[PDB]
PDB file of C-alpha atoms in Angstrom:
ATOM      1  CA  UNK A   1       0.000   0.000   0.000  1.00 18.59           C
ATOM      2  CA  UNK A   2       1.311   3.381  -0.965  1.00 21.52           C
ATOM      3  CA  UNK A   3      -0.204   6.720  -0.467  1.00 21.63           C
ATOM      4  CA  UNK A   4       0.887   9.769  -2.355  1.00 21.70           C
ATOM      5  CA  UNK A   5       0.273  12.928  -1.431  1.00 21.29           C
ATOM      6  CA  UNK A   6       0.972  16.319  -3.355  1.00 23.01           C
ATOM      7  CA  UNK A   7       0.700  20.349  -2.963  1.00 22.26           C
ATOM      8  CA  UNK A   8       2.051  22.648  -5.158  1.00 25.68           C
ATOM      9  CA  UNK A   9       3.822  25.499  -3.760  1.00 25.80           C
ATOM     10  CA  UNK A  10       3.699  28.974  -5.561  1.00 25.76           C
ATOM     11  CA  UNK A  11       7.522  29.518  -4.755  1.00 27.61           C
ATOM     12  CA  UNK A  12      10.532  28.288  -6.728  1.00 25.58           C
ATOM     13  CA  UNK A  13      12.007  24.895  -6.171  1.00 32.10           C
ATOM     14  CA  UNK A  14      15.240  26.327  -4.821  1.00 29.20           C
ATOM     15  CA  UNK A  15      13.665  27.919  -1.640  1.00 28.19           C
ATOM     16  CA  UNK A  16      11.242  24.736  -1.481  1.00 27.99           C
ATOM     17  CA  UNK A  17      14.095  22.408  -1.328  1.00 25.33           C
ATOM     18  CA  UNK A  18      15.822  24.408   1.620  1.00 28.70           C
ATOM     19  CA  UNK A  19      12.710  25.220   3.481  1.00 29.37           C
ATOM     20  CA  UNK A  20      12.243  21.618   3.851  1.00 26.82           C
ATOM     21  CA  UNK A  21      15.726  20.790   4.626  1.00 26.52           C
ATOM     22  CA  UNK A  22      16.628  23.616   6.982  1.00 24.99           C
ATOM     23  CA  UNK A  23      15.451  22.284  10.890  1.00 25.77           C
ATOM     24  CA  UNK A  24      14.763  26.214  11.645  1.00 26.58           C
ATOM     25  CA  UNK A  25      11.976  26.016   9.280  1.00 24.71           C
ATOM     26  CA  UNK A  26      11.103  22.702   9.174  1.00 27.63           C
ATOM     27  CA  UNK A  27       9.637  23.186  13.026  1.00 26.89           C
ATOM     28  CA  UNK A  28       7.496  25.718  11.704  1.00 26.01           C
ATOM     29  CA  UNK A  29       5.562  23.315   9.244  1.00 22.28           C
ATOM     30  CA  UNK A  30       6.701  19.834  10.895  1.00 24.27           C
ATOM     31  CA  UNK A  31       2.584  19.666  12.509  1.00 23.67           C
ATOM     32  CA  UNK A  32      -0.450  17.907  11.222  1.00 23.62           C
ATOM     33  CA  UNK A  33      -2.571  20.694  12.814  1.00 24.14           C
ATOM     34  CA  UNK A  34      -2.100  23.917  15.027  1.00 23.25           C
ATOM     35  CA  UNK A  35      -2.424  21.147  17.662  1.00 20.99           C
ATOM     36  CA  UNK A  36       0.737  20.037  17.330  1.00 17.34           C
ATOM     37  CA  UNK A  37       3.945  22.346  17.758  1.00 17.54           C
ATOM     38  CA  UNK A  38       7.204  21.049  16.513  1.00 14.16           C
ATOM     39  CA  UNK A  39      10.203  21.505  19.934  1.00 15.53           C
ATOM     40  CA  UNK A  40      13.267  20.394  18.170  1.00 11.55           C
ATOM     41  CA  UNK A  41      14.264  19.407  15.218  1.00 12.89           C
ATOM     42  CA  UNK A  42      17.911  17.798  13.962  1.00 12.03           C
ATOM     43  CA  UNK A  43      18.326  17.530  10.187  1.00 10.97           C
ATOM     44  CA  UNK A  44      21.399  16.486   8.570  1.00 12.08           C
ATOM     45  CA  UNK A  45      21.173  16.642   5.071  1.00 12.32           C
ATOM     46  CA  UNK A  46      23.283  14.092   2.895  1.00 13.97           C
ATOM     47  CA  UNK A  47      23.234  11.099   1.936  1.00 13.94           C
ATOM     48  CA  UNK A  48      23.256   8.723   5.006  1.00 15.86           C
ATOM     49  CA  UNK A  49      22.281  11.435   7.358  1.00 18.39           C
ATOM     50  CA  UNK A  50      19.361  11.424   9.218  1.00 15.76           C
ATOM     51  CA  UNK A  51      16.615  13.662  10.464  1.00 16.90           C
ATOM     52  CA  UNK A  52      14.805  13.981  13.912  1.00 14.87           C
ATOM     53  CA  UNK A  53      12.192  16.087  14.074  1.00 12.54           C
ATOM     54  CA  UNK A  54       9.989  16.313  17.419  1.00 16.45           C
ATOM     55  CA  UNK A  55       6.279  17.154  16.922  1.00 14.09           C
ATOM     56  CA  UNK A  56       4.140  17.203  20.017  1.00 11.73           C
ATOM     57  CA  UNK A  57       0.509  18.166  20.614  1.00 12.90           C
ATOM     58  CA  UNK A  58      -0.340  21.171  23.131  1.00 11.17           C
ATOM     59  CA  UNK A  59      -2.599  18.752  24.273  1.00  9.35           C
ATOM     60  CA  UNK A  60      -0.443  17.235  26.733  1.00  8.50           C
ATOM     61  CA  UNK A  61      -0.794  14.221  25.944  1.00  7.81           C
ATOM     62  CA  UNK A  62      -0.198  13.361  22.353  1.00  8.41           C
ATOM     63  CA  UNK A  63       3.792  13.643  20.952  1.00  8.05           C
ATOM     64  CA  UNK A  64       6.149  11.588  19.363  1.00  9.97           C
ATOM     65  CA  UNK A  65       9.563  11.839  17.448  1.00 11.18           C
ATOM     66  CA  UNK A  66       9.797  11.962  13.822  1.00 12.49           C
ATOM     67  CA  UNK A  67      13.186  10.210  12.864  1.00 10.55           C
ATOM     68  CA  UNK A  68      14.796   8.801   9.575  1.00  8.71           C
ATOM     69  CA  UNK A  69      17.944   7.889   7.045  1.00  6.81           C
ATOM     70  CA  UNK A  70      18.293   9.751   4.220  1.00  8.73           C
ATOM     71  CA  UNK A  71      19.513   7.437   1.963  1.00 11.07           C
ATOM     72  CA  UNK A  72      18.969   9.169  -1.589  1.00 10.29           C
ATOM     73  CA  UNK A  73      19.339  12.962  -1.664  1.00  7.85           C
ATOM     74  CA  UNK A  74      18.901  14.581  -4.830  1.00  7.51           C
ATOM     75  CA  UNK A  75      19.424  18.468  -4.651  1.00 12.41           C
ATOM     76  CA  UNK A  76      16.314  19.859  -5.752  1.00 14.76           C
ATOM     77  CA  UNK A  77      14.812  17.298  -7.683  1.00 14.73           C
ATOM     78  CA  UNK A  78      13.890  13.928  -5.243  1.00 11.66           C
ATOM     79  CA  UNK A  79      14.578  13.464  -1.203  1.00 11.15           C
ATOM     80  CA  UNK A  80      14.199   9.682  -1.239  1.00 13.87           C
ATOM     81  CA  UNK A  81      14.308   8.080   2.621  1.00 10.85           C
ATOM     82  CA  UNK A  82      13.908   5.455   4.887  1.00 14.57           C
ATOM     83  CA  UNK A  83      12.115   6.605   8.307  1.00 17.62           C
ATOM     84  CA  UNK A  84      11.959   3.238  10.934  1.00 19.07           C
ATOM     85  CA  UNK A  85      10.834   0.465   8.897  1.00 20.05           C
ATOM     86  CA  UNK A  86       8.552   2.419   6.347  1.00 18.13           C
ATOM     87  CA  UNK A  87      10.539   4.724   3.290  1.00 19.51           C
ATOM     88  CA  UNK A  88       9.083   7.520   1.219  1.00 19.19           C
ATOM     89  CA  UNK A  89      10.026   9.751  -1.189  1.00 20.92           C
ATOM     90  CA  UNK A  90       9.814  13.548  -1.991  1.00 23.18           C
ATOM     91  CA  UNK A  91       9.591  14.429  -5.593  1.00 22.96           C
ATOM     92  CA  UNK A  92       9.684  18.231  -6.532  1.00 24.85           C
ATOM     93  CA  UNK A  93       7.595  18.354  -9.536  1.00 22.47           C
ATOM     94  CA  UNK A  94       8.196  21.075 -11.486  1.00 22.49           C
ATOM     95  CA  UNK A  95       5.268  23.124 -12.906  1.00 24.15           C
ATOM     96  CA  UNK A  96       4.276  26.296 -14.548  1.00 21.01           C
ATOM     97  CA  UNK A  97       2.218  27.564 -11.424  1.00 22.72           C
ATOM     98  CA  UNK A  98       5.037  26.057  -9.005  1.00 25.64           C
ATOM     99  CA  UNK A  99       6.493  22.727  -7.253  1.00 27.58           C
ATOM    100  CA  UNK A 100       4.114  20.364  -6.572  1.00 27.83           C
ATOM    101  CA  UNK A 101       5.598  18.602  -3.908  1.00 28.78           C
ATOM    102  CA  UNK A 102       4.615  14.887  -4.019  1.00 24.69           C
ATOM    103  CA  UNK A 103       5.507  12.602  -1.102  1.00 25.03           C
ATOM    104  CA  UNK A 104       4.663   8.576  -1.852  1.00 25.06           C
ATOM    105  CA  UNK A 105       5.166   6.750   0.882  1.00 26.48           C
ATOM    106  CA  UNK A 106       4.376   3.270   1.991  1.00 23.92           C
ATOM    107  CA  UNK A 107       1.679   2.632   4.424  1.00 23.46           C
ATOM    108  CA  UNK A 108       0.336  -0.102   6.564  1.00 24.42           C
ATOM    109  CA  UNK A 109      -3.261  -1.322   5.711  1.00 25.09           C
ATOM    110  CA  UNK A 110      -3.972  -2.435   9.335  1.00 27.73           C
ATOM    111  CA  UNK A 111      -3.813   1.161   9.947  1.00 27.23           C
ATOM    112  CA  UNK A 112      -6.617   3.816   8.826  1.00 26.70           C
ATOM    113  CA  UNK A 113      -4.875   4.671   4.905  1.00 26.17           C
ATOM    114  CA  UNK A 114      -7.275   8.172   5.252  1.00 25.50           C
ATOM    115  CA  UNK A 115      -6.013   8.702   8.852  1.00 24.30           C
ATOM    116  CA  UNK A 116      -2.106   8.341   7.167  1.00 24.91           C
ATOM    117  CA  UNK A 117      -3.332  10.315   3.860  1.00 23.60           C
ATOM    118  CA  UNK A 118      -4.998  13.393   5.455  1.00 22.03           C
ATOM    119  CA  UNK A 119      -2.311  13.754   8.315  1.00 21.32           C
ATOM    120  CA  UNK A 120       0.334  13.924   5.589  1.00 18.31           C
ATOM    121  CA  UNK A 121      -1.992  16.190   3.557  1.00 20.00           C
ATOM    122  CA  UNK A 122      -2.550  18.568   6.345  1.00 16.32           C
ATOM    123  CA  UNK A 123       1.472  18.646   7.098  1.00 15.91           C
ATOM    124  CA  UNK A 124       1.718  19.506   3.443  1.00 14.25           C
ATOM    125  CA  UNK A 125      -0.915  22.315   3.373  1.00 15.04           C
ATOM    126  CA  UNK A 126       0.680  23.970   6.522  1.00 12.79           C
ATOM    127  CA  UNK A 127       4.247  23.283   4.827  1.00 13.98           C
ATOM    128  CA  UNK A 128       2.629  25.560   1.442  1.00 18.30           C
ATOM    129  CA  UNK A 129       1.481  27.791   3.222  1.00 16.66           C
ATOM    130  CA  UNK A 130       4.781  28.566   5.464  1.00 19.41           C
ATOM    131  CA  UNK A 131       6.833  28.273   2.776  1.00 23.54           C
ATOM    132  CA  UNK A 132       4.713  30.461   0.492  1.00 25.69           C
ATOM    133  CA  UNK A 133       4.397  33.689   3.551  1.00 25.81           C
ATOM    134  CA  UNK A 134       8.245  33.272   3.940  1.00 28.02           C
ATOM    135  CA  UNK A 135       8.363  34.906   0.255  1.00 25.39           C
ATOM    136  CA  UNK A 136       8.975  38.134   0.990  1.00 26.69           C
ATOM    137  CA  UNK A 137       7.647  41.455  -1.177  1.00 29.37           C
ATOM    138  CA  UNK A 138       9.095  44.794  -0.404  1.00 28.47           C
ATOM    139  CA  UNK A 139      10.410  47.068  -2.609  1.00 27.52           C
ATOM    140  CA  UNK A 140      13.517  44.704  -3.601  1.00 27.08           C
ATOM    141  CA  UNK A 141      16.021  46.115  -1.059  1.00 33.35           C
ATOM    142  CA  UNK A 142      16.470  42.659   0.322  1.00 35.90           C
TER     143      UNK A 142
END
């Protein structure tokens, strides 16, 4: 069973890529909902580096750690890795309007597949979205 999921961001690939690499940014979007609130976050991009991102709920109750291998890193074209037991991949697809960033990943049918779908959905809406108000607009200077 595989689920893929897709967005497409209105900013170029370039800032994509490192807004989804960079752990400074990646706790801003690393959260299924407003809910949950990413604490920490170690990235280290390359391949056979891994990532640990912490997202917990302000709940109190729900939070868990998000680790994994990169084990394929292709600059601004496909982050393919291995997180536990499960692997997915991140393509940056390239279109006219912007990247759509599409995430297939493999998922367990014992578990609810819309549960898995819509959690990574709403991670990649709130990922847009963050990446899309960091573009800045003033009058150039920066």
């Amino acid at each position: 069973m595989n689920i893929t999921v897709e967005t497409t961001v209105a900013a170029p690939v370039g800032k994509v890529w490192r807004a989804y690499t960079t752990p400074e940014d990646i706790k801003q979007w690393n959260a299924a909902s407003d809910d949950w609130h990413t604490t920490a976050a170690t990235v280290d991009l390359r391949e056979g580096g891994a990532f640990s991102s912490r997202m917990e709920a302000k709940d109190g109750s729900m939070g868990f750690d998000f680790a994994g291998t990169y084990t394929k890193v292709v600059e601004n074209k496909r982050i393919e890795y291995a997180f536990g037991d499960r692997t997915a991949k991140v393509e940056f697809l390239e279109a006219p309007q912007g990247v759509t960033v599409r995430v297939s990943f493999v998922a367990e049918t014992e578990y609810p597949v819309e549960q898995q779908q819509q959690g990574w959905q709403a991670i990649l809406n709130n990922f847009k979205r963050h990446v899309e108000s960091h573009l800045e607009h003033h009058h150039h200077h920066h």
